[PDB]
Enzyme design. Structure first.
Site, short mmCIF file in Angstrom:
data_model
loop_
_atom_site.label_atom_id
_atom_site.label_comp_id
_atom_site.label_asym_id
_atom_site.label_seq_id
_atom_site.Cartn_x
_atom_site.Cartn_y
_atom_site.Cartn_z
N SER A 66 8.37 13.37 23.83
CA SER A 66 9.41 13.95 24.01
C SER A 66 10.71 13.08 23.98
O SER A 66 10.96 12.30 22.88
CB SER A 66 9.45 14.74 25.37
OG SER A 66 10.64 15.71 25.64
N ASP A 85 5.94 23.84 18.43
CA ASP A 85 7.13 23.53 19.42
C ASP A 85 8.51 23.75 18.60
O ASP A 85 8.51 23.42 17.58
CB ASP A 85 6.95 22.13 19.79
CG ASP A 85 8.03 21.46 20.59
OD1 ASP A 85 8.69 22.15 21.49
OD2 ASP A 85 8.24 20.11 20.44
N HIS A 134 4.95 21.52 22.47
CA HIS A 134 5.72 20.20 22.78
C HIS A 134 4.71 19.15 23.63
O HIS A 134 4.88 18.18 23.30
CB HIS A 134 6.85 20.38 23.88
CG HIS A 134 7.60 19.39 24.19
ND1 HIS A 134 8.45 18.94 23.00
CD2 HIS A 134 8.32 18.96 25.11
CE1 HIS A 134 9.28 17.97 23.38
NE2 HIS A 134 9.38 18.17 24.51
#
Ligand SMILES: *[C@@H]1O[C@H](CO)[C@@H](O[C@@H]2O[C@H](CO)[C@@H](O)[C@H](O)[C@H]2NC(C)=O)[C@H](O)[C@H]1NC(C)=O
Ligand SMILES: *[C@@H]1O[C@H](CO)[C@@H](O[C@H]2O[C@H](CO)[C@@H](O)[C@H](O)[C@H]2NC(C)=O)[C@H](O)[C@H]1NC(C)=O
Ligand SMILES: *[C@@H]1O[C@H](CO)[C@@H](O)[C@H](O)[C@H]1NC(C)=O
Ligand SMILES: *[C@@H]1O[C@H](CO)[C@@H](O)[C@H](O)[C@H]1NC(C)=O
Lengths: 452, 450
Positions: free
Chosen positions: B150, B370, B427
């Site tokens: 991330s 994601d 994600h």
């Protein structure tokens, strides 16, 4: 109802059904006999819509829709047990699963000549539907809906056009799941689907755009350009011959290959139903030499393990129970020969849908599971938009309250007058199999004319 | 190793671990103490690589990666029980989970001033790594790998550039999962993503193509056309403010479709990383707080109750060697994310710097469902580095017990940098596809073809 067709003691069920269900044959054109399996609504069958369900192929069985998708019970991996289905479509409708055309499943014809085409199949199903009503006269007044999946996206509207010409049939609407409405819009949207879902990469995508496109227009349908075709051939290999599941990108492939065929002991198993990239001058397997070789050949839907279902249906006692002539050969989910000899005639369902929409008497729904690649949601969304109808509702998401994990977005819906396009988020080609509760919720609001 | 830091008996586990694990603080610049939780390799930790794991936010905890992603044990819904993880990354590496920056989780600073930026964060982490090696000198010659996910797409390469400069650190490679390598590339590919995944429709797509694009390019990042901006604001709403889970399109949103309120607590879920070049929009601005209500920030469509409930157990805190005066653990710190200053817009320089030495093994891996840091944005980013192609794009495989060998995703290799997708993962890749993630990680560590 024909008492002689009713199913008395269906194997694999520990506790017998609380609703009546029949199994027999509906006569059709020529020497044709279509095996049907009717399951009455579990509530008020007397006043529940009669819903016809057709699977696709061409050459595949609608008992797939019963036993593995939305029937009152579903076959288990043992190919012996049937467990009741909480999301059965027959909970609110009298559902008729029809194995069509002849030669598919337990369906047959006296001469056993199975080569057919779009027009003949719609007339055969139409005549069979007439027979059903003569066998079940009590349902002549029940609201009728014609439903199906995949190739039935062709079957359904062609059959619907015949039915609308019969005033005796109370045609109220039609619904098609991941249907093949237009080969062009389907083949084109798929190439795009593939790049954006990460299967292609920029180099391939770049050459494709270079050799098959001019302006923002791409022709991935009938392009003859040399390097363009060389690229589409790879796209074809990656999408369906590399081990990916064309019915659900995000699911494993049952018995995954890296090829265009596979062997199962000593049977050649072919899994290309011939509906994709048909107009491209691609190189393909010689399906035509398969029958001359003398090797056993079977067609299975792609990445699908037909064992459970085939093991169930081919059981002498089940055949007995379902009132199946002992002489009929073994049941297979798809008939290779039927598929191989089938002749597609229509280019798209535009005229049929336009003809049905002109009356403004019918309720129509096209629904697509959004992770399917065989009849991706985009090709069908394009299709519906190309009908150029009056918009009733701007695109929006539709919800489903799950076993109190709150309401969740089940997909998106576009409504025009008399026709709605809808997606089932997370579902593949066989929407009822992937999203049981949402498929049912969608089915229920359709029948009931409730907004999605 | 710091004996006093060793976690002797961790609550929740019905059986004690076979490996030694430590929990303490790594000192960094100024008043800062970063809470670390080191778990040794379950097999030959002495010779196993040291692997730093950082989560993102900015302002969220790396214990998320431990307890919910790829730690040796994961927290169960009861927020009481921990179950061992057979796909743990610590099965083959001495993993170091670090809560950063200061103010996140159990980390703090004597002065409590938590406003920070990218530059200060990498320096902070660098000094923390220096301290870890002071505490664990035995691990100095062990290959060092820097991994994260991330926002750690910015944290990781910036830290590697500092680390690259310290010859005493045995840097061997870095790996970033669904990392935010480029705001522009993330935003432009996300709009395409939105359409081709069925969230937009052609009526909206046409309007976008008409106002934001010119000659088979589009600018969905910093476009100045007013109608284009009106369209992009709609795309942003559907993607991150309509009930869809931005971390996994095909997954439900924890709590369903309606600001989770928890009685005197307004929960905000806007981390601030997408469509950053559109007109100013802050979700918290909408919050109407009573005097005495607190605002807690949680990852979008995620439920942090099990982890927070477990971590705030007085006994857990004690076994983790956490100073009693420290505030309650939260997976993310609203105030830290709020005062956080993003300095880099792209990680191109950082990666080019690390690639020039041809000394480090680099991997960017994305779960393809994601939408926060979609796979295409990062595939584009990696392609834009213009490195030598070693491996032409192909599928990579994972042998499943039930499924047999299946395609786990696609991998494209360049000299020293590989881009890889995890099919069906979102994600938080290890949470979504534990077996594929561990398989990838193992082939990465062992320099084996994917
Ligand atoms: C990012 O953080 C660093 C650390 O706070 C900032 O640099 C400091 O800036 C202040 C004010 O100008 C000085 O008093 C310090 O001496 C600086 N510290 C260091 C280590 O250089 C930096 O300016 C911040 N903002 C930006 C945009 O980089
Ligand atoms: C569709 O299939 C049917 C049967 O396979 C075809 O039917 C025709 O076949 C012969 C050629 O016209 C005739 O001898 C038959 O009498 C005739 N049957 C009917 C009902 O018309 C039909 O031509 C096929 N259609 C196409 C376009 O191939
Ligand atoms: C197919 O189904 C049968 C019965 O459900 C099962 O035994 C078999 O392992 C399944 N998969 C394959 C690849 O045959
Ligand atoms: C969050 O998770 C906890 C424990 O795992 C559960 O009790 C709670 O109901 C969940 N809340 C939501 C909104 O999902």
């Amino acid at each position: 109802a024909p008492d002689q067709d009713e199913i008395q003691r269906l194997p694999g069920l520990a506790k017998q059904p609380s609703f009546r269900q029949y199994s027999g044959y509906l006569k059709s054109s020529g020497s044709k006999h279509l095996h049907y399996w009717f399951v009455e609504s579990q509530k008020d069958p007397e006043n529940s819509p009669v819903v016809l369900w057709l699977n696709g192929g061409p050459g595949c069985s609608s008992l797939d829709g019963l036993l593995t998708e939305h029937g009152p019970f579903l076959v288990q991996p043992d190919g012996v047990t049937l467990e009741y289905n909480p999301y059965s479509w027959n909970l609110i409708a009298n559902v008729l699963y029809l194995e069509s055309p002849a030669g598919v499943g337990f369906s047959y014809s006296d001469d056993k000549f199975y080569a057919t085409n779009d027009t003949e199949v719609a007339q055969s199903n139409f005549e069979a539907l007439q027979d059903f009503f003569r066998l079940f006269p009590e349902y002549k007044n029940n609201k009728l809906f014609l439903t199906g999946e995949s190739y039935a996206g062709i079957y359904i509207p062609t059959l619907a056009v015949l039915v609308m010409q019969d005033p005796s049939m109370n045609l109220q609407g039609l619904a098609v799941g991941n249907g093949l409405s237009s080969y062009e819009q389907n083949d084109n949207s798929l190439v795009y689907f593939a790049y954006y879902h990460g299967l292609l990469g920029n180099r391939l995508w770049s050459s494709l755009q270079t050799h098959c496109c001019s302006q923002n227009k791409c022709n991935f349908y009938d392009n003859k350009d040399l390097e363009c075709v060389t690229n589409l051939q790879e796209v074809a290999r990656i999408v369906g011959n590399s081990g990916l599941n064309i019915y659900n990108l995000y699911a494993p492939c049952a018995g995954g290959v890296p090829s265009h065929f596979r062997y199962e002991k000593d049977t050649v198993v072919v899994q290309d139903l011939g509906n994709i990239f048909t107009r491209l001058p691609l190189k393909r397997m010689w399906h035509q030499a398969l029958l001359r070789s003398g090797d056993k050949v079977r067609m299975d839907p792609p990445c699908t393990n037909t064992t459970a279902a085939s093991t169930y249906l081919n059981n002498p006692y089940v055949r007995k129970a379902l009132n199946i002539p002992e002489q009929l050969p073994q049941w297979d989910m798809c008939n290779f020969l039927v598929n191989l000899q089938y002749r597609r005639l229509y280019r798209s369902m535009n005229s049929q849908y336009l003809k049905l929409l002109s009356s403004q008497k019918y309720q129509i729904l096209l629904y697509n599971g959004d992770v399917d690649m065989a009849c991706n949601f985009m090709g069908d969304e394009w299709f519906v938009d190309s009908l150029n109808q009056k918009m009733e509702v701007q695109r929006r998401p539709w919800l489903v309250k799950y076993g109190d994990s709150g309401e969740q977005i089940a997909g998106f819906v576009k409504e025009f007058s008399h026709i709605a396009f809808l997606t089932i988020k997370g579902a593949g080609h066989m929407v009822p199999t992937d999203k049981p509760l949402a498929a049912f919720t969608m089915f229920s609001r359709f029948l009931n004319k409730q907004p999605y």
